[PDB]
Design a protein around this ligand. Structure first.
Ligand code: POV
Ligand code: ZK1
Ligand code: D10
Lengths: 50, 403
């Protein structure tokens, strides 16, 4: 025998259901949605002038 | 009867100094040096710390030595196993060993850590010249496509700038060239956009994966030229006197700056200097003895580091009064200790082995984090600016067409 290391067993660490959204923070996704609505409305408004 | 001094890495008082006091139990680099110098030269020594608590100097009127020079010229103690900057005045009154440690005026700066990502950071993966060449390449391609479709066909200038922009931003094109000479332009601009977008994405991935930090300043030869970073000494001592008595170009400039600069860059004490470096940003640099800086960068919180070589070299000795029969018994032993690799081992242990932090453990330690809104907001600003501009030009066209 001998002196041996002992460390905590690494868990499986299953990924989250919506883990694909991690590379961008929550604020970025929600500001994407809000800028989308803003751009759609501005494009509509500018398109229509009579 | 050998003196000493209280500098922390050299002679220190251990925990519960009451229980462990005196020569029997002291801790320090100079303590181990004294032990080894006795092991090589057996003698009776009792560790008598200097009463005055400072190093030698003479008052112009008093004309007396104080500290570990006064304790030696006046027969108060045998020798002084402690850091003495060998110098002309001290030598003229004591007999100095060969330097058991050489050093200089190092440069101390705060450890370079990642800054807050600035606005307009999204265009970092490509150099400025590439961005400008992209803009003018787009404006050149659109003009050439217009000229081609108007030699030999709705590709007017307005309707061709839109096609080129659509092809660059990967969004589908409304129309496509029909002639041969329009299709050549279309094809080569498609290839160009493909390569540029792939290059931008790849280099951005490289930026995000491995981070590479660079020291803002490398050496005093460039610290003089920078002048956007304030660098300061202690109040008065070897460092300030050296800079005022210097005559080299770079050092004379680094003194002319600090002589006339506000606020008070000169620091009251070294603890205040390191506190100021740690508290402030990379705009403050501290010029201290090399050994003290190397020692400081090892203790917690390990927020500082040493950059650049030593500006001027001077060594530390083991003093001994002129008439001593022990005067020549220390030169040879110091040289032998230096040659055996024992003094270096002592310093290595005392400074790195008793180190609060280690370089190898945190060498990579890489962790990646989600892109915060701070990184990107430089494009949200541009988006809303473009929308405001679009509404503005819409109203201008409406008002012009109404009349
Ligand atoms: C409402 C309308 C526009 C938004 C107004 C923004 C004000 C609020 C942000 C304040 C701010 O942080 O200033 C920042 C941004 O300041 C800017 O000037 C943003 C640039 C967007 C303006 C329109 C872009 C082009 C238009 C469409 C084109 C088609 C400071 O920016 P800076 O002064 O340029 O300094 C560089 C910063 N750096 C050091 C990190 C590189
Ligand atoms: O003989 C001298 N030997 C000295 C040795 C040291 C150190 F090595 F660090 F112990 C220092 N320090 C420099 C900053 O860190 C704390 C004290 C000062 C010394 N001084 C005064 P100087 O003129 O300011 O150099 C001397 O005169
Ligand atoms: C964090 C959940 C919100 C993400 C919304 C993703 C939709 C973006 C496409 C418009």
């Amino acid at each position: 025998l001998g002196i041996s290391i002992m460390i905590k067993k690494p868990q499986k660490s299953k990924p989250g259901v919506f883990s694909f959204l991690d590379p961008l923070a929550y604020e970025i996704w929600m500001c994407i949605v809000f800028a989308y609505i803003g751009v759609s409305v501005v494009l509509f408004l500018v398109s229509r002038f009579s | 009867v050998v003196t000493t001094i209280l500098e922390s890495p050299y002679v220190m008082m251990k925990k519960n100094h009451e229980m462990l006091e005196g020569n029997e139990r002291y801790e320090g680099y100079c303590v181990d040096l004294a032990a080894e110098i006795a092991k090589h030269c057996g003698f009776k020594y009792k560790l008598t710390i200097v009463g005055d608590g400072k190093y030698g100097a003479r008052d112009a009127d008093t004309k007396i030595w104080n500290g570990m020079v006064g304790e030696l010229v006046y027969g108060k103690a045998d020798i002084a196993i402690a850091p003495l900057t060998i110098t002309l005045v001290r030598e003229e009154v004591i007999d100095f060993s060969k330097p058991f440690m050489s050093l200089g005026i190092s440069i101390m700066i705060k450890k370079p850590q990642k800054s807050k990502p600035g606005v307009f950071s999204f265009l970092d993966p490509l150099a400025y010249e590439i961005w400008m060449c992209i803009v003018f390449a787009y404006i050149g391609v659109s003009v050439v496509l217009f000229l081609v479709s108007r030699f030999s066909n709705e590709f007017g200038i307005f309707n061709s700038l839109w096609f080129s922009l659509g092809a660059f931003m990967r969004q589908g094109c409304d129309i496509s060239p029909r002639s041969l000479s329009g299709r050549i332009v279309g094809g080569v601009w498609w290839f160009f956009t493909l390569i540029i977008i792939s290059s931008y994405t790849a280099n951005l991935a490289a930026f995000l994966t491995v981070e590479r930090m660079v020291s803002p300043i490398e050496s005093a030869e460039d610290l003089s030229k920078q002048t956007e970073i304030a660098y300061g000494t202690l109040d008065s001592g070897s460092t300030k006197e050296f800079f005022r008595r210097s005559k080299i170009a770079v050092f004379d400039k680094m003194w002319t700056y600090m002589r006339s600069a506000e606020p008070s860059v000169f620091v009251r004490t070294t603890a205040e200097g390191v506190a100021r470096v740690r508290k402030s940003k990379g705009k403050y640099a501290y010029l201290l003895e090399s050994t003290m800086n190397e020692y400081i960068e090892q203790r917690k919180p390990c927020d500082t580091m040493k950059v650049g070589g030593n500006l001027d070299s001077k060594g530390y000795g083991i003093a001994t009064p002129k008439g001593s029969s022990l005067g020549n018994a220390v030169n040879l032993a110091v040289l032998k200790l230096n040659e055996e690799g024992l003094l270096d081992k002592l310093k290595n242990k005392w400074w790195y082995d008793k180190g609060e932090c280690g370089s190898g453990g945190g060498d990579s330690k890489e962790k990646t984090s989600a892109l915060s809104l701070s990184n990107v907001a430089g494009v949200f600003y541009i988006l809303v600016g473009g929308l405001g501009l679009a509404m503005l030009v819409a109203l201008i066209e409406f008002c012009y067409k109404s009349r």
